[PDB]
């Protein structure tokens, strides 16, 4: 088996797939059990009939994962259920390699735990784990769609890079140079998917009936009905009266999921018995918290301050290079107008001499990163940068996590 299996482990949902495929296999990474005790696996949460009162537990915390039991079971589930995930089928994966994506701020002890759990139980042969950052430079290896937006106006892997990820857990900004990312100018923003959902809960509680036990509705509302302030907080407030959306409660007797309507459009004239929540202000106020955390009265600096200071740590010669090619990554970036807004903000902050450009992959960036990693598996530099079974056996699990993929080494 020449092509490996690519696993982009996400805190919210993991993306597992063969290197042959062009799209990842999406499987949730969580565990929700009804109050009556009938627990359900992560992939089976979407098929449940009630979402009002559930007990939740997600193996991946803010920093990283600690207990490998649930993750190992879920990995086997996505690795030993060919029926539920069509096309894919495997016996042992002995000759199959592994391409994984794990954060650059991992705990060395937890990195050792991950290495041992991936190698000495499932009996792999070759591994390669690296953060989603380094692979995006390989976008120059394969042709793809890549919308470059200019801030000012109204080998194969690229050495110069500065990429931001914004998923469910948190946000990470990384500078990559010479294909070797810098591990000191890296800056972490705690606002992730979790924190945006929490802000959504609090602001609806400030507006409409509470749902704090019902967090799946919060996640769905956050993914569906929000949009980033295209120009400014005040001017977007001027559109609050004219523009508004209306969500309808999901009636478990009738519909497990609700819907959002616009009063302008008459394509849905059907009246409904259940109550309807009007969202006129929180559509655009919620995304603003990245630039104005003090709306939620936090002492957090903000995204623009974080990127400016991260640039400040970098050497002056390499500072203008990074902003000239910026790639947007993460599931939070799918919110509309976010990329243009952040581009305008940082270009306004950055001085006139250097113009910064932001590259957006169309659609979600999760599948973009997955296809990038699949191309990396296709890319032959992976052959020279790979490791073998005898390297793992001849040394201890500590050497593999402290020498090659260790982060203090690249500091």
């Amino acid at each position: 088996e020449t092509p490996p299996i690519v696993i982009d482990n996400g805190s919210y949902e993991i993306k597992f797939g063969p290197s042959t495929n062009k799209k990842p296999f999406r499987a949730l990474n969580a565990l929700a059990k009804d109050k009556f005790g009938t627990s359900y696996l992560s992939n089976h949460i979407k098929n449940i009939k009630d979402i009002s009162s559930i007990t939740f537990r997600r193996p991946h915390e803010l920093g990283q994962l600690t207990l490998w039991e649930l993750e190992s079971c879920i990995w086997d589930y996505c690795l030993f259920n060919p029926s539920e995930f069509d096309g894919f089928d495997l016996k042992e994966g002995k000759g199959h390699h592994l391409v994984a994506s794990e954060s650059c701020m991992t705990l060395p002890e937890l990195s050792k735990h991950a290495d041992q759990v991936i190698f000495e139980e499932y009996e792999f042969d070759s591994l390669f784990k690296s953060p989603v950052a380094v692979f995006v430079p390989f976008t120059k290896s394969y042709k793809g769609e890549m919308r470059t937006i200019s801030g000012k106006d109204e080998s194969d892997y690229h050495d110069f890079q500065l990429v931001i990820d914004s998923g469910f857990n948190c946000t990470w900004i990384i500078p990559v140079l010479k294909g070797i990312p810098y591990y000191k100018a890296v800056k972490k923003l705690d606002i992730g998917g979790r924190f945006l959902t929490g802000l959504l809960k609090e602001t609806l509680s400030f507006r409409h009936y509470n749902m704090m036990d019902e967090t799946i509705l919060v996640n769905n509302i956050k993914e569906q009905c929000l949009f980033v302030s295209p120009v400014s907080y005040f001017d977007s407030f001027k559109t609050k009266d004219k523009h508004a959306l209306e969500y309808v409660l999901p009636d478990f007797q009738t519909s497990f999921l609700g819907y959002v309507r616009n009063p302008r459009k008459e394509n849905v004239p059907l009246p409904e018995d259940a109550q309807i929540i009007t969202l006129t202000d929180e559509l655009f106020t919620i995304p603003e918290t990245f630039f104005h955390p003090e709306i939620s009265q936090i002492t957090k600096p903000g995204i623009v301050e974080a990127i400016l200071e991260s640039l400040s740590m970098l050497p002056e010669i390499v500072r203008p290079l990074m902003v000239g090619n910026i790639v947007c990554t993460g599931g939070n970036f799918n919110l509309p107008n976010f990329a243009q807004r952040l581009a305008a903000e940082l270009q306004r902050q950055l001085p006139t001499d250097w113009t910064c450009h932001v590259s957006v992959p169309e659609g979600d960036c999760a599948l973009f990163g997955w296809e990038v990693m699949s191309q990396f598996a296709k890319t032959d530099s992976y052959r020279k940068a790979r490791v073998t079974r005898e390297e793992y056996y001849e040394h201890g699990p500590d050497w593999c996590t402290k020498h090659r993929f260790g982060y203090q080494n690249w500091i």
């Binding site: 039991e69 030993f80 259920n81 967090t215 009265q297 200071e309």
Partner: protein, 207 residues
């Protein structure tokens, strides 16, 4: 000013002008009347309150509300005693190790299966079994010496900002709604209010 005004030569502070209906006729400072980093504008108590509100926004369920002291201790290394004393806040709880899910997962992948044994009995196998029955807390990771102190230094202070905490000005809009014009501070609670309805909704519970 109107020309020719009578003064009595007492007090007569040209930069101090105090006028009221005289219900108390007392200065707010007569005799000390009582009884750019954001860490400077907001004191240690205020930044810690912002931090614990942040951690309490992190949780998505009831069960992690008492997990806030543990999470904050893992973050900044503060004992839970002062967390419960000074923060002044507003089996599913004990990680995912329930055996019920462990035997229920069998029906999840029961559609197709072909397991085979390929394993040995070594110290690595014992450690793998220990990791499989993990049941460990972040507090156990940090208290133990399994992670180097330099790793702690490069995982804790590689994120925080120390000199520039703000680069954009603050909107400072009302707490309840977003009235952007004619904002003003409240009489007692000291929070910005804009509309009459906002003041009526704020004076009861928030104020």
């Amino acid at each position: 000013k109107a020309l020719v005004e009578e003064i009595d030569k007492k007090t007569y502070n040209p930069d101090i002008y105090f006028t009221s209906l005289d219900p108390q006729a007392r200065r707010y400072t007569s005799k000390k009347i009582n009884k750019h980093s954001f860490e400077e504008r907001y004191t240690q108590q205020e930044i810690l309150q912002s931090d614990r509100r942040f951690m309490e926004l992190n949780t998505e369920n009831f069960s992690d509300l008492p997990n806030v002291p543990t999470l904050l201790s893992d973050l900044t290394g503060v004992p839970r005693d002062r967390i419960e004393s000074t923060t002044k806040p507003i089996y599913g709880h004990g990680w995912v190790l329930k055996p019920e899910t462990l035997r229920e997962i069998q029906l999840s992948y029961k559609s197709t299966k072909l397991p085979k044994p390929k394993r040995k009995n070594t110290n690595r196998i014992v450690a793998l079994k220990k990791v499989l029955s993990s049941k460990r807390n972040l507090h156990s990771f940090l208290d133990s010496a399994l992670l180097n102190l330099m790793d702690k230094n490069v995982i804790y202070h590689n994120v925080y900002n120390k000199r520039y905490f703000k680069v954009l000005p603050l909107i400072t809009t009302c707490s309840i709604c977003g009235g952007y014009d004619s904002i003003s501070s409240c009489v007692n609670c000291g929070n910005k209010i804009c509309s009459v309805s906002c003041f009526k909704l704020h004076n009861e519970t928030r104020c």
